[PDB]
Amino acid sequence: GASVKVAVRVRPFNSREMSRDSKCIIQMSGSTTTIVNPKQPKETPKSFSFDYSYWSHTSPEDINYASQKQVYRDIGEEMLQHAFEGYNVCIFAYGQTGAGKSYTMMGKQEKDQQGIIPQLCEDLFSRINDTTNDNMSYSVEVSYMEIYCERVRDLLNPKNKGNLRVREHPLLGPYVEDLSKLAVTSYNDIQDLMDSGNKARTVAATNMNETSSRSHAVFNIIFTQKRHDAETNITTEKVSKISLVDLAGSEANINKSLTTLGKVISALAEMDFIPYRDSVLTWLLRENLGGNSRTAMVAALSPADINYDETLSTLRYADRAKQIRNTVHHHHH
Ligand SMILES: Nc1ncnc2c1ncn2[C@@H]1O[C@H](COP(=O)(O)OP(=O)(O)CP(=O)(O)O)[C@@H](O)[C@H]1O
Ligand SMILES: [Mg+2]
């Protein structure tokens, strides 16, 4: 099996940390991330090694700053190329509330501050429009959903209050019943759906009416490749499912999916039964976590001393995911 690739990324201090005069307890070198314990400075700092340790604590003027472009060119680009090979792929952002999950996955729409999802979509349509072999034609379908307190809402159709039911097809696996699946033929169109979708996510008074720290957003693309050949006249089809996930803060019930995800990751790392069905998230993502898919985790980290316990926990869960291996033959030309 192909190992689930893992990257961790530390962001600059935020308003909260600055108001408390937080010092940085995170260091990076190569693919290694080290964390210092602010309360017990007498211990030896704990180090963790990953596929990538992104230092984004400073600002783009730094030669060592890990940009949106590097984060995408490393893992995003790799997954898209796998989609083109015909493999199902998944990228999920994990981490404590405010560590930088949405920035990494969505980013902002200016200043080349766009995250993994916008860059991958753009890259996808660019590659498709660069095609010169008329025997190839493409189809791109998108779906966008939110999972909040186990409830699933269609973000591309906030015009229906149905809490869509997650089901298990008798033969083809889990799916969200009646979740809208829209055909898109340009990056501009997909971006427009992404934008309105982002506008439909649940907010929380508790988060100063900002998007609720407890909702999960799953962005799916169904990429179909059709290859003709004037001959026998059969068109062959290659279908890849791209799942881009932005999880709720790691710190019918509020934290079921996240706690269950932790258990699934731990169990998989150990095994190499798994409670996939214990939550809607782990259920829908069953094949991406141990199944037929190329998967990657990007763990967001706060650099502040005040978030030590939470950051250590994220690093430890990212270390375990690194141990997961999914289960995913041509002729010499
Ligand atoms: N690599 C980076 N470089 C510069 N700023 C970053 C950054 N990563 C995150 N930020 C900033 O840090 C703040 C918090 O990040 P963000 O809102 O994306 O976190 P998050 O999605 O983990 C919160 P929640 O758990 O509630 O969903 C934002 O103001 C964001 O722009
Ligand atoms: Mg977020």
Side-chain angles (χ1 to χ4, degrees), residues 142-178:
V142 63
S143 119
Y144 198 10
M145 72 183 99
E146 159 181 274
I147 302 175
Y148 174 68
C149 294
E150 291 312 86
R151 293 185 228 121
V152 189
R153 289 182 42 250
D154 185 348
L155 293 180
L156 303 186
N157 196 198
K159 7 232 188 169
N160 122 102
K161 307 300 211 335
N163 277 324
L164 311 193
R165 186 195 178 187
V166 178
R167 307 190 64 178
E168 174 73 34
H169 186 93
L171 291 163
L172 302 175
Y175 69 102
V176 180
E177 192 171 53
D178 295 305

mmCIF file of all heavy atoms in Angstrom, residues 142-178:
data_model
loop_
_atom_site.group_PDB
_atom_site.id
_atom_site.type_symbol
_atom_site.label_atom_id
_atom_site.label_comp_id
_atom_site.label_asym_id
_atom_site.label_seq_id
_atom_site.Cartn_x
_atom_site.Cartn_y
_atom_site.Cartn_z
ATOM 1 N N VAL A 142 -19.034 18.680 -9.507
ATOM 2 C CA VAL A 142 -18.654 19.085 -8.169
ATOM 3 C C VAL A 142 -19.802 18.989 -7.164
ATOM 4 O O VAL A 142 -20.979 19.080 -7.516
ATOM 5 C CB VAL A 142 -18.093 20.536 -8.169
ATOM 6 C CG1 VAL A 142 -19.182 21.515 -8.619
ATOM 7 C CG2 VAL A 142 -17.595 20.915 -6.789
ATOM 8 N N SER A 143 -19.435 18.781 -5.908
ATOM 9 C CA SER A 143 -20.401 18.690 -4.824
ATOM 10 C C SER A 143 -19.696 19.314 -3.638
ATOM 11 O O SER A 143 -18.473 19.234 -3.526
ATOM 12 C CB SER A 143 -20.756 17.229 -4.541
ATOM 13 O OG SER A 143 -20.396 16.876 -3.223
ATOM 14 N N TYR A 144 -20.456 19.944 -2.754
ATOM 15 C CA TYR A 144 -19.865 20.604 -1.607
ATOM 16 C C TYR A 144 -20.839 20.461 -0.447
ATOM 17 O O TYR A 144 -21.990 20.887 -0.526
ATOM 18 C CB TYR A 144 -19.626 22.076 -1.980
ATOM 19 C CG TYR A 144 -18.658 22.847 -1.121
ATOM 20 C CD1 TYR A 144 -17.851 22.210 -0.177
ATOM 21 C CD2 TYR A 144 -18.526 24.230 -1.276
ATOM 22 C CE1 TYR A 144 -16.936 22.937 0.594
ATOM 23 C CE2 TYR A 144 -17.619 24.963 -0.518
ATOM 24 C CZ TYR A 144 -16.832 24.316 0.416
ATOM 25 O OH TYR A 144 -15.984 25.047 1.212
ATOM 26 N N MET A 145 -20.370 19.884 0.649
ATOM 27 C CA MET A 145 -21.253 19.661 1.781
ATOM 28 C C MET A 145 -20.616 20.073 3.074
ATOM 29 O O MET A 145 -19.403 20.229 3.173
ATOM 30 C CB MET A 145 -21.627 18.173 1.858
ATOM 31 C CG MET A 145 -20.460 17.286 2.319
ATOM 32 S SD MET A 145 -20.820 15.490 2.342
ATOM 33 C CE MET A 145 -20.077 14.950 0.782
ATOM 34 N N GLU A 146 -21.453 20.263 4.079
ATOM 35 C CA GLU A 146 -20.967 20.622 5.389
ATOM 36 C C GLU A 146 -21.477 19.562 6.354
ATOM 37 O O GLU A 146 -22.583 19.060 6.191
ATOM 38 C CB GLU A 146 -21.509 21.982 5.820
ATOM 39 C CG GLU A 146 -21.461 22.178 7.323
ATOM 40 C CD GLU A 146 -22.025 23.508 7.770
ATOM 41 O OE1 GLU A 146 -21.267 24.504 7.790
ATOM 42 O OE2 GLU A 146 -23.229 23.553 8.101
ATOM 43 N N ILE A 147 -20.664 19.212 7.343
ATOM 44 C CA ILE A 147 -21.088 18.238 8.344
ATOM 45 C C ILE A 147 -20.990 18.955 9.673
ATOM 46 O O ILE A 147 -19.906 19.340 10.105
ATOM 47 C CB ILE A 147 -20.197 16.976 8.346
ATOM 48 C CG1 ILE A 147 -20.221 16.329 6.957
ATOM 49 C CG2 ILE A 147 -20.725 15.975 9.385
ATOM 50 C CD1 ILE A 147 -19.288 15.128 6.791
ATOM 51 N N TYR A 148 -22.138 19.153 10.311
ATOM 52 C CA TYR A 148 -22.198 19.860 11.578
ATOM 53 C C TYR A 148 -23.061 19.088 12.574
ATOM 54 O O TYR A 148 -24.251 18.882 12.347
ATOM 55 C CB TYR A 148 -22.780 21.252 11.329
ATOM 56 C CG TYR A 148 -23.032 22.071 12.569
ATOM 57 C CD1 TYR A 148 -21.979 22.537 13.351
ATOM 58 C CD2 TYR A 148 -24.334 22.379 12.959
ATOM 59 C CE1 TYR A 148 -22.214 23.292 14.498
ATOM 60 C CE2 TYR A 148 -24.584 23.130 14.100
ATOM 61 C CZ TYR A 148 -23.524 23.582 14.865
ATOM 62 O OH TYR A 148 -23.776 24.307 16.003
ATOM 63 N N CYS A 149 -22.460 18.671 13.681
ATOM 64 C CA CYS A 149 -23.192 17.896 14.676
ATOM 65 C C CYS A 149 -23.834 16.700 13.993
ATOM 66 O O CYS A 149 -25.017 16.418 14.185
ATOM 67 C CB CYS A 149 -24.264 18.753 15.345
ATOM 68 S SG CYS A 149 -23.570 20.084 16.319
ATOM 69 N N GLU A 150 -23.040 16.026 13.165
ATOM 70 C CA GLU A 150 -23.468 14.839 12.440
ATOM 71 C C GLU A 150 -24.486 15.104 11.334
ATOM 72 O O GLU A 150 -24.858 14.210 10.585
ATOM 73 C CB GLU A 150 -24.015 13.801 13.430
ATOM 74 C CG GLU A 150 -22.930 13.210 14.299
ATOM 75 C CD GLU A 150 -21.737 12.772 13.473
ATOM 76 O OE1 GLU A 150 -20.860 13.625 13.199
ATOM 77 O OE2 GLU A 150 -21.685 11.585 13.069
ATOM 78 N N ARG A 151 -24.934 16.341 11.227
ATOM 79 C CA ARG A 151 -25.892 16.708 10.214
ATOM 80 C C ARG A 151 -25.238 17.149 8.910
ATOM 81 O O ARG A 151 -24.345 17.975 8.922
ATOM 82 C CB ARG A 151 -26.814 17.799 10.747
ATOM 83 C CG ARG A 151 -27.709 17.313 11.867
ATOM 84 C CD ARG A 151 -28.701 18.359 12.321
ATOM 85 N NE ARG A 151 -28.712 18.464 13.768
ATOM 86 C CZ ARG A 151 -28.450 19.563 14.450
ATOM 87 N NH1 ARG A 151 -28.169 20.650 13.764
ATOM 88 N NH2 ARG A 151 -28.396 19.563 15.778
ATOM 89 N N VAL A 152 -25.695 16.639 7.778
ATOM 90 C CA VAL A 152 -25.080 16.973 6.513
ATOM 91 C C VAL A 152 -25.916 17.987 5.742
ATOM 92 O O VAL A 152 -27.151 17.769 5.524
ATOM 93 C CB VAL A 152 -24.916 15.736 5.615
ATOM 94 C CG1 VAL A 152 -24.084 16.049 4.411
ATOM 95 C CG2 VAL A 152 -24.291 14.639 6.459
ATOM 96 N N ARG A 153 -25.343 19.114 5.301
ATOM 97 C CA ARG A 153 -26.099 20.127 4.515
ATOM 98 C C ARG A 153 -25.436 20.337 3.138
ATOM 99 O O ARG A 153 -24.208 20.377 3.024
ATOM 100 C CB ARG A 153 -26.137 21.460 5.276
ATOM 101 C CG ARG A 153 -27.022 21.431 6.524
ATOM 102 C CD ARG A 153 -27.067 22.799 7.204
ATOM 103 N NE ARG A 153 -27.188 23.869 6.209
ATOM 104 C CZ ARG A 153 -26.218 24.729 5.913
ATOM 105 N NH1 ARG A 153 -25.053 24.661 6.541
ATOM 106 N NH2 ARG A 153 -26.403 25.642 4.971
ATOM 107 N N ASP A 154 -26.254 20.452 2.096
ATOM 108 C CA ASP A 154 -25.752 20.678 0.740
ATOM 109 C C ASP A 154 -25.446 22.170 0.579
ATOM 110 O O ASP A 154 -26.363 22.994 0.551
ATOM 111 C CB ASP A 154 -26.808 20.249 -0.276
ATOM 112 C CG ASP A 154 -26.319 20.330 -1.712
ATOM 113 O OD1 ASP A 154 -25.246 20.918 -1.971
ATOM 114 O OD2 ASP A 154 -27.017 19.801 -2.597
ATOM 115 N N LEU A 155 -24.163 22.515 0.478
ATOM 116 C CA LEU A 155 -23.752 23.913 0.339
ATOM 117 C C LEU A 155 -23.967 24.506 -1.050
ATOM 118 O O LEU A 155 -23.837 25.720 -1.230
ATOM 119 C CB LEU A 155 -22.280 24.086 0.726
ATOM 120 C CG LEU A 155 -21.886 23.878 2.185
ATOM 121 C CD1 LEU A 155 -20.402 24.120 2.286
ATOM 122 C CD2 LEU A 155 -22.647 24.819 3.123
ATOM 123 N N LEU A 156 -24.277 23.657 -2.025
ATOM 124 C CA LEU A 156 -24.523 24.111 -3.387
ATOM 125 C C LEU A 156 -26.028 24.244 -3.598
ATOM 126 O O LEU A 156 -26.487 24.587 -4.686
ATOM 127 C CB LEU A 156 -23.924 23.120 -4.393
ATOM 128 C CG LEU A 156 -22.428 22.891 -4.193
ATOM 129 C CD1 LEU A 156 -21.885 22.019 -5.304
ATOM 130 C CD2 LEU A 156 -21.700 24.216 -4.171
ATOM 131 N N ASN A 157 -26.790 23.975 -2.543
ATOM 132 C CA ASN A 157 -28.244 24.061 -2.613
ATOM 133 C C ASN A 157 -28.777 24.399 -1.213
ATOM 134 O O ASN A 157 -29.522 23.616 -0.619
ATOM 135 C CB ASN A 157 -28.810 22.718 -3.109
ATOM 136 C CG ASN A 157 -30.257 22.815 -3.593
ATOM 137 O OD1 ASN A 157 -30.955 21.811 -3.704
ATOM 138 N ND2 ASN A 157 -30.700 24.024 -3.911
ATOM 139 N N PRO A 158 -28.370 25.567 -0.657
ATOM 140 C CA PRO A 158 -28.811 26.009 0.674
ATOM 141 C C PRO A 158 -30.286 26.330 0.632
ATOM 142 O O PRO A 158 -30.872 26.816 1.593
ATOM 143 C CB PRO A 158 -27.942 27.237 0.967
ATOM 144 C CG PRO A 158 -27.550 27.730 -0.385
ATOM 145 C CD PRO A 158 -27.364 26.489 -1.211
ATOM 146 N N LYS A 159 -30.869 26.021 -0.516
ATOM 147 C CA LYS A 159 -32.267 26.254 -0.805
ATOM 148 C C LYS A 159 -33.137 25.060 -0.389
ATOM 149 O O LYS A 159 -34.328 25.003 -0.705
ATOM 150 C CB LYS A 159 -32.371 26.558 -2.301
ATOM 151 C CG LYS A 159 -31.014 26.349 -2.987
ATOM 152 C CD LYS A 159 -30.544 27.518 -3.831
ATOM 153 C CE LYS A 159 -29.298 27.144 -4.627
ATOM 154 N NZ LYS A 159 -28.987 28.179 -5.658
ATOM 155 N N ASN A 160 -32.526 24.108 0.315
ATOM 156 C CA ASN A 160 -33.241 22.941 0.827
ATOM 157 C C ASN A 160 -32.695 22.665 2.244
ATOM 158 O O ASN A 160 -31.484 22.702 2.488
ATOM 159 C CB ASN A 160 -33.128 21.758 -0.187
ATOM 160 C CG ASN A 160 -32.511 20.494 0.402
ATOM 161 O OD1 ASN A 160 -33.205 19.534 0.731
ATOM 162 N ND2 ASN A 160 -31.184 20.487 0.507
ATOM 163 N N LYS A 161 -33.624 22.481 3.180
ATOM 164 C CA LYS A 161 -33.301 22.305 4.597
ATOM 165 C C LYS A 161 -33.191 20.879 5.080
ATOM 166 O O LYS A 161 -32.870 20.614 6.247
ATOM 167 C CB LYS A 161 -34.339 23.044 5.432
ATOM 168 C CG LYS A 161 -34.503 24.508 5.024
ATOM 169 C CD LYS A 161 -33.198 25.284 5.174
ATOM 170 C CE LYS A 161 -33.461 26.741 5.519
ATOM 171 N NZ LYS A 161 -34.808 27.176 5.040
ATOM 172 N N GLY A 162 -33.461 19.955 4.178
ATOM 173 C CA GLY A 162 -33.194 18.563 4.278
ATOM 174 C C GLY A 162 -31.864 18.456 4.943
ATOM 175 O O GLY A 162 -30.904 19.125 4.584
ATOM 176 N N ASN A 163 -31.844 17.750 6.048
ATOM 177 C CA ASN A 163 -30.572 17.250 6.473
ATOM 178 C C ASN A 163 -30.367 15.913 5.815
ATOM 179 O O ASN A 163 -30.996 14.921 6.157
ATOM 180 C CB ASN A 163 -30.607 17.083 7.992
ATOM 181 C CG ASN A 163 -30.323 18.410 8.648
ATOM 182 O OD1 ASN A 163 -29.526 19.212 8.170
ATOM 183 N ND2 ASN A 163 -31.003 18.638 9.784
ATOM 184 N N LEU A 164 -29.598 15.984 4.737
ATOM 185 C CA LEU A 164 -29.365 14.836 3.892
ATOM 186 C C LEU A 164 -28.882 13.670 4.723
ATOM 187 O O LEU A 164 -28.058 13.784 5.623
ATOM 188 C CB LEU A 164 -28.343 15.176 2.820
ATOM 189 C CG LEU A 164 -28.649 16.480 2.101
ATOM 190 C CD1 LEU A 164 -27.794 16.585 0.860
ATOM 191 C CD2 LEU A 164 -30.115 16.520 1.716
ATOM 192 N N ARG A 165 -29.438 12.540 4.348
ATOM 193 C CA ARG A 165 -29.172 11.266 4.985
ATOM 194 C C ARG A 165 -27.995 10.584 4.310
ATOM 195 O O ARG A 165 -27.931 10.454 3.095
ATOM 196 C CB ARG A 165 -30.423 10.398 4.856
ATOM 197 C CG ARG A 165 -30.295 9.078 5.617
ATOM 198 C CD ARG A 165 -31.362 8.062 5.194
ATOM 199 N NE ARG A 165 -31.175 6.794 5.906
ATOM 200 C CZ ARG A 165 -31.944 5.755 5.530
ATOM 201 N NH1 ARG A 165 -32.821 5.896 4.551
ATOM 202 N NH2 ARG A 165 -31.819 4.580 6.155
ATOM 203 N N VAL A 166 -27.044 10.162 5.139
ATOM 204 C CA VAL A 166 -25.884 9.436 4.667
ATOM 205 C C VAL A 166 -26.337 7.986 4.629
ATOM 206 O O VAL A 166 -26.865 7.469 5.621
ATOM 207 C CB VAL A 166 -24.703 9.566 5.644
ATOM 208 C CG1 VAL A 166 -23.519 8.740 5.134
ATOM 209 C CG2 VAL A 166 -24.307 11.022 5.793
ATOM 210 N N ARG A 167 -26.142 7.338 3.487
ATOM 211 C CA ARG A 167 -26.550 5.951 3.331
ATOM 212 C C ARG A 167 -25.409 5.050 2.873
ATOM 213 O O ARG A 167 -24.323 5.515 2.529
ATOM 214 C CB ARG A 167 -27.706 5.851 2.327
ATOM 215 C CG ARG A 167 -28.882 6.759 2.642
ATOM 216 C CD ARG A 167 -30.076 6.435 1.770
ATOM 217 N NE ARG A 167 -30.587 5.089 2.034
ATOM 218 C CZ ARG A 167 -31.645 4.564 1.429
ATOM 219 N NH1 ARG A 167 -32.311 5.269 0.523
ATOM 220 N NH2 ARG A 167 -32.037 3.330 1.729
ATOM 221 N N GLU A 168 -25.674 3.750 2.881
ATOM 222 C CA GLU A 168 -24.702 2.758 2.455
ATOM 223 C C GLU A 168 -25.345 2.058 1.289
ATOM 224 O O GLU A 168 -26.362 1.378 1.452
ATOM 225 C CB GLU A 168 -24.428 1.751 3.574
ATOM 226 C CG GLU A 168 -23.522 0.574 3.186
ATOM 227 C CD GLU A 168 -22.073 0.974 3.026
ATOM 228 O OE1 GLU A 168 -21.622 1.875 3.766
ATOM 229 O OE2 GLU A 168 -21.375 0.376 2.175
ATOM 230 N N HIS A 169 -24.789 2.249 0.098
ATOM 231 C CA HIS A 169 -25.344 1.593 -1.070
ATOM 232 C C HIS A 169 -25.047 0.107 -0.862
ATOM 233 O O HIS A 169 -23.952 -0.257 -0.433
ATOM 234 C CB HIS A 169 -24.660 2.095 -2.339
ATOM 235 C CG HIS A 169 -25.273 1.567 -3.594
ATOM 236 N ND1 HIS A 169 -26.253 2.249 -4.286
ATOM 237 C CD2 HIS A 169 -25.082 0.406 -4.262
ATOM 238 C CE1 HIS A 169 -26.637 1.531 -5.324
ATOM 239 N NE2 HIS A 169 -25.943 0.407 -5.333
ATOM 240 N N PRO A 170 -26.005 -0.772 -1.181
ATOM 241 C CA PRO A 170 -25.758 -2.206 -0.985
ATOM 242 C C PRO A 170 -24.512 -2.769 -1.667
ATOM 243 O O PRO A 170 -23.935 -3.744 -1.195
ATOM 244 C CB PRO A 170 -27.052 -2.849 -1.484
ATOM 245 C CG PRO A 170 -27.529 -1.890 -2.520
ATOM 246 C CD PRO A 170 -27.295 -0.550 -1.853
ATOM 247 N N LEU A 171 -24.090 -2.148 -2.766
ATOM 248 C CA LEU A 171 -22.915 -2.615 -3.494
ATOM 249 C C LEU A 171 -21.808 -1.571 -3.661
ATOM 250 O O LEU A 171 -20.619 -1.908 -3.612
ATOM 251 C CB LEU A 171 -23.330 -3.104 -4.885
ATOM 252 C CG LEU A 171 -24.163 -4.381 -5.018
ATOM 253 C CD1 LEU A 171 -24.789 -4.439 -6.391
ATOM 254 C CD2 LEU A 171 -23.272 -5.602 -4.782
ATOM 255 N N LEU A 172 -22.194 -0.306 -3.825
ATOM 256 C CA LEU A 172 -21.191 0.750 -4.149
ATOM 257 C C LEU A 172 -20.690 1.624 -2.951
ATOM 258 O O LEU A 172 -19.985 2.610 -3.120
ATOM 259 C CB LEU A 172 -21.784 1.648 -5.236
ATOM 260 C CG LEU A 172 -22.173 0.865 -6.493
ATOM 261 C CD1 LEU A 172 -22.878 1.742 -7.530
ATOM 262 C CD2 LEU A 172 -20.970 0.247 -7.202
ATOM 263 N N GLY A 173 -21.005 1.290 -1.706
ATOM 264 C CA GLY A 173 -20.471 2.077 -0.612
ATOM 265 C C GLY A 173 -21.310 3.241 -0.127
ATOM 266 O O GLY A 173 -22.435 3.422 -0.570
ATOM 267 N N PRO A 174 -20.771 4.059 0.784
ATOM 268 C CA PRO A 174 -21.474 5.215 1.344
ATOM 269 C C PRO A 174 -21.661 6.392 0.385
ATOM 270 O O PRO A 174 -20.814 6.653 -0.473
ATOM 271 C CB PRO A 174 -20.607 5.590 2.533
ATOM 272 C CG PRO A 174 -19.240 5.305 2.019
ATOM 273 C CD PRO A 174 -19.402 3.970 1.321
ATOM 274 N N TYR A 175 -22.781 7.092 0.542
ATOM 275 C CA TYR A 175 -23.082 8.260 -0.273
ATOM 276 C C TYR A 175 -24.074 9.148 0.476
ATOM 277 O O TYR A 175 -24.736 8.686 1.413
ATOM 278 C CB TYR A 175 -23.665 7.851 -1.630
ATOM 279 C CG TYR A 175 -25.055 7.256 -1.580
ATOM 280 C CD1 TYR A 175 -26.172 8.018 -1.934
ATOM 281 C CD2 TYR A 175 -25.257 5.932 -1.196
ATOM 282 C CE1 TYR A 175 -27.458 7.474 -1.906
ATOM 283 C CE2 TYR A 175 -26.538 5.376 -1.165
ATOM 284 C CZ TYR A 175 -27.633 6.149 -1.519
ATOM 285 O OH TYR A 175 -28.896 5.605 -1.494
ATOM 286 N N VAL A 176 -24.145 10.423 0.093
ATOM 287 C CA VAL A 176 -25.079 11.358 0.715
ATOM 288 C C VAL A 176 -26.284 11.405 -0.204
ATOM 289 O O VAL A 176 -26.180 11.799 -1.366
ATOM 290 C CB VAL A 176 -24.472 12.771 0.850
ATOM 291 C CG1 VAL A 176 -25.476 13.711 1.513
ATOM 292 C CG2 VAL A 176 -23.191 12.706 1.672
ATOM 293 N N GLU A 177 -27.430 10.974 0.307
ATOM 294 C CA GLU A 177 -28.639 10.936 -0.499
ATOM 295 C C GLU A 177 -29.111 12.322 -0.944
ATOM 296 O O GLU A 177 -29.241 13.240 -0.135
ATOM 297 C CB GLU A 177 -29.747 10.223 0.280
ATOM 298 C CG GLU A 177 -30.967 9.871 -0.544
ATOM 299 C CD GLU A 177 -31.929 8.969 0.212
ATOM 300 O OE1 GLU A 177 -32.320 9.325 1.348
ATOM 301 O OE2 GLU A 177 -32.292 7.904 -0.335
ATOM 302 N N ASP A 178 -29.358 12.446 -2.244
ATOM 303 C CA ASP A 178 -29.829 13.681 -2.859
ATOM 304 C C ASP A 178 -28.858 14.862 -2.799
ATOM 305 O O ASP A 178 -29.264 16.007 -2.993
ATOM 306 C CB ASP A 178 -31.175 14.093 -2.249
ATOM 307 C CG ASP A 178 -32.278 13.094 -2.543
ATOM 308 O OD1 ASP A 178 -32.514 12.795 -3.736
ATOM 309 O OD2 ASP A 178 -32.911 12.610 -1.575
#
